[PDB]
Design a protein around this ligand. Sequence first.
Ligand code: T4Y
Ligand code: T4Y
Lengths: 304, 304
Amino acid sequence: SGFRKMAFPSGKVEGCMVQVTCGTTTLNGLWLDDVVYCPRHVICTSEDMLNPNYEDLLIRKSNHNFLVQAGNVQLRVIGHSMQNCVLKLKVDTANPKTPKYKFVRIQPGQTFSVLACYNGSPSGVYQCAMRPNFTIKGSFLNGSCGSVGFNIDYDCVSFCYMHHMELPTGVHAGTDLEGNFYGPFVDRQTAQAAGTDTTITVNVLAWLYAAVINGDRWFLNRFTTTLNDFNLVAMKYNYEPLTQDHVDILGPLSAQTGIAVLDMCASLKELLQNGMNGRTILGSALLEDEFTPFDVVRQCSGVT
Amino acid sequence: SGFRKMAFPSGKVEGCMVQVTCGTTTLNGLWLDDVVYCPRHVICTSEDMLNPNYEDLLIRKSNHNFLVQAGNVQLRVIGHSMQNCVLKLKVDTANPKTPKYKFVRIQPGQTFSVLACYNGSPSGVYQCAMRPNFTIKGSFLNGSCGSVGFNIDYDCVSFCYMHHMELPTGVHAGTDLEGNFYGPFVDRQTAQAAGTDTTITVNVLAWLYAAVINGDRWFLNRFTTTLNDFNLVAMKYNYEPLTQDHVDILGPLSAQTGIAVLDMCASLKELLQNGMNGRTILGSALLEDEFTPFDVVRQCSGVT
Ligand SMILES: *CC(=O)N1CCCN(Cc2ccccc2C)CC1
Ligand SMILES: *CC(=O)N1CCCN(Cc2ccccc2C)CC1
């Protein structure tokens, strides 16, 4: 019992983190097989970051200009290419600690663990969600670029995020491992405002399911609603609209708790319309939206 | 920028987790050098848990009754002893993945990372505090006993917690690695009510410092207070009393932000007396007390 913002064990990803230095710029790389993946702005000085031409900048660089350190041992770079906003460095050694892995591009609403890194050294691990505006609310200091977000299924690491950018508003933008940015963000020091940070409605409902399962039930009410009625309330409160797909995904939690999805929606509706009245749910004074139904099932079943 | 509930990278502790089976009971062990540490109630059935005599129960057990599995390879048990509420199993192999480590007994207010485990397999990692009533607010399902709490300094793991017990109220009790319970808890299925869960005042002030450093400053006011005046307010709201030691510890955060500790105390006072007025601080609608001044300095400096 008890419910916690829970990250994947970070071990398998700790074994992949390296330091990448190009001239004076240092950030983190990800060493999988005989390839090190890092943000392409490794080749920039802050003098370049206002209007960088990455193709032109990279012409000036050679395999020996990319200093890759794995602990206190240097990797020999035998090749380099630009894929979208990442560099792939070919090294002459496969990472012996390469886990089973995939690169997956996640959807907004989906959660993942970040291993925050500085000079290829892991510092901490936390749980994130891809916000509906394709930002993540991270904790990232200078030198954290190249840190990766990941999910783990038994033995298999799915890398979904590389950290690249902090918006003036202190939220975070980055790429999948093919170097494609989530949202409209570009690796350039320019005016880039985030869209509306809407609340991930299906994740709030999953979290209300988690609450019921762990004893917090004061918010359960006598009411129900319809998808259309609920969504009128959702819109007013900048909640993502709830679909029949979302309802289907909440099915197993529905089944476990014996509370119909649309009844729980009615509970959420009254919570939006009335607030918490100074009360708390799983030790939170607001509605948590960074637990997926899958996350709730996991932490309330005990998958390893 | 951004502030997250952040755990230590769990890798070094993942390499130490094993499965311990005694007859039909299975839980987690910690393999350091040629010793596996697990909760002593591994020797119990739920039939024993009402009034277990551990000395008498252990007489009936032998080295070969303690089945220790590390992945899919079995460790040979060449010895066993009871230390307080832990068993130490001597194995014929030193854990090749033993990190540098210490056993440290933490004080209430101090934070640590938990690696939640089931059948010696890590499932997730989160950040905890030893509550002033010597409970922790964990997330622990059946089979999670033996999971450990830890801190990491560069290369050195300080193990402070082994999970043993869930109180009827769904909070968690456990031992240090010498098998001594935090608080008055005993590994027995008996009436055990937790004391007052007071708020860790120095950790709230550290968190307010973190907020200021990350841009959230609406709660800064024109007032100051005294240690004695503040503590009258602390008592009323079941906040731990603030000492000159707490003020000394907040010194570096004070220095960085240019806000005097007693001014910030006055900010906290008005927050207690007036609440948040439906506002938030670092994305929280209540006062977070599970970040130590040391945690704030770390996440706002970037230690690895
Ligand atoms: C993430 C990190 O290590 N750094 C801090 C922020 C990114 N920065 C480069 C930069 C600056 C402005 C706009 C875009 C980018 C990519 C330096 C490294
Ligand atoms: C933690 C774990 O794996 N288990 C669930 C709770 C502990 N339990 C044994 C028990 C039961 C009641 C009171 C005390 C104790 C130690 C079984 C294993």
